[PDB]
Amino acid sequence: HHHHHHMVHITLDRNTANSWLIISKDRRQVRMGDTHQNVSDNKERFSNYPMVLGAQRFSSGKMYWEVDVTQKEAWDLGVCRDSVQRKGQFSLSPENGFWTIWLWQDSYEAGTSPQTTLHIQVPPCQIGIFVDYEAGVVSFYNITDHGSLIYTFSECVFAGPLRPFFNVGFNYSGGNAAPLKLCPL
Ligand SMILES: CC(C)N(C)c1ncnc2c1cnn2C
Ligand SMILES: CC(C)N(C)c1ncnc2c1cnn2C
């Protein structure tokens, strides 16, 4: 792909984070803590899952960023509406304001409803995410495999400002402690 020149500097918004997440000083990394991280509750925090938003809001233009997923067993990545539900249980789909892919139980899927199987020969260590607001497109790229296309959501109906979306996943197995990291431009 040739989307690299739309690179944007994403930082994580602490206030949206589930209370067990640990966000680094530079706001560029996030991991699952082994306990509540001693923060006060607020209406922005994702309560039920290990999720956090980027601070940046996008309402026009073309945007690109990269995320490191090295050695993780489970995670979700993409974008979401600024007004997605924070509390309780919910489906990760465009109907609920999410445009995402994930890894779970050794397979990759796109968060359509129902979910779509992805075809990945080279497990990615870094994922590229491209958003074209005007076109209604969200695309995902395998940086480990020379930028090959993973998935394109087209005909997107964003219906609001978009925020970068992250889920570090649970660590029930003891094999999913590694962080998500925003990769340098
Ligand atoms: C098969 C569906 C319902 N599950 C379990 C999931 N869907 C999307 N992201 C997920 C999971 C599990 N972990 N993460 C990060
Ligand atoms: C929001 C949902 C899709 N997420 C991230 C989930 N994560 C982990 N386990 C899950 C789910 C859903 N069901 N189950 C059993």
UniProtKB/Swiss-Prot annotation:
* UniProt domain B30.2/SPRY: residue ranges: 8-185
Which superkingdom does the taxonomy of this entry point to?
Answer: Eukaryota
Query: Could you tell me what induces this protein?
Result: Up-regulated by IFN.
Q: What does the UniProt PTM comment say about this protein? A: Autoubiquitinated; does not lead to its proteasomal degradation. Deubiquitinated by USP4; leading to its stabilization. Autoubiquitinated.
Q: Where in the cell is it found?
A: Cytoplasm; Cytoplasmic vesicle, Autophagosome; Nucleus; Cytoplasm, P-body
Tell me the function of this protein: E3 ubiquitin-protein ligase whose activity is dependent on E2 enzymes, UBE2D1, UBE2D2, UBE2E1 and UBE2E2. Forms a ubiquitin ligase complex in cooperation with the E2 UBE2D2 that is used not only for the ubiquitination of USP4 and IKBKB but also for its self-ubiquitination. Component of cullin-RING-based SCF (SKP1-CUL1-F-box protein) E3 ubiquitin-protein ligase complexes such as SCF(SKP2)-like complexes. A TRIM21-containing SCF(SKP2)-like complex is shown to mediate ubiquitination of CDKN1B ('Thr-187' phosphorylated-form), thereby promoting its degradation by the proteasome.
Q: How does it assemble?
A: Homotrimer. Component of a SCF(SKP2)-like complex containing CUL1, SKP1, TRIM21 and SKP2. Interacts with CALR, CUL1, FBXW11, HSPA5, IKBKB, IRF3, SKP1 and VCP. Interacts with SKP2; the interaction with SKP2 does not depend on an intact F-box domain. Interacts (via N-terminus and C-terminus) with DCP2 (via N-terminus and C-terminus). Interacts (via C-terminus) with IRF8 (via C-terminus). Interacts with ULK1, BECN1 and with ATG8 family members, including GABARAP, GABARAPL1, GABARAPL2 and MAP1LC3C/LC3C. Interacts with TRIM21 and SQSTM1/sequestosome 1. Interacts with IRF3.
Q: Which family does it belong to?
A: Belongs to the TRIM/RBCC family.
Q: What is known of its domains?
A: The coiled-coil is necessary for the cytoplasmic localization. The RING-type zinc finger is necessary for ubiquitination and for the IRF3-driven interferon beta promoter activity. Interacts with SKP2 and CUL1 in a RING finger-independent manner. The RING-type zinc finger is necessary for ubiquitination of NMI.
Protein name per the record: E3 ubiquitin-protein ligase TRIM21
Q: Which organism is it from?
A: Mus musculus (Mouse)
First-to-last residue of the parent protein present:
291 to 468 of 470
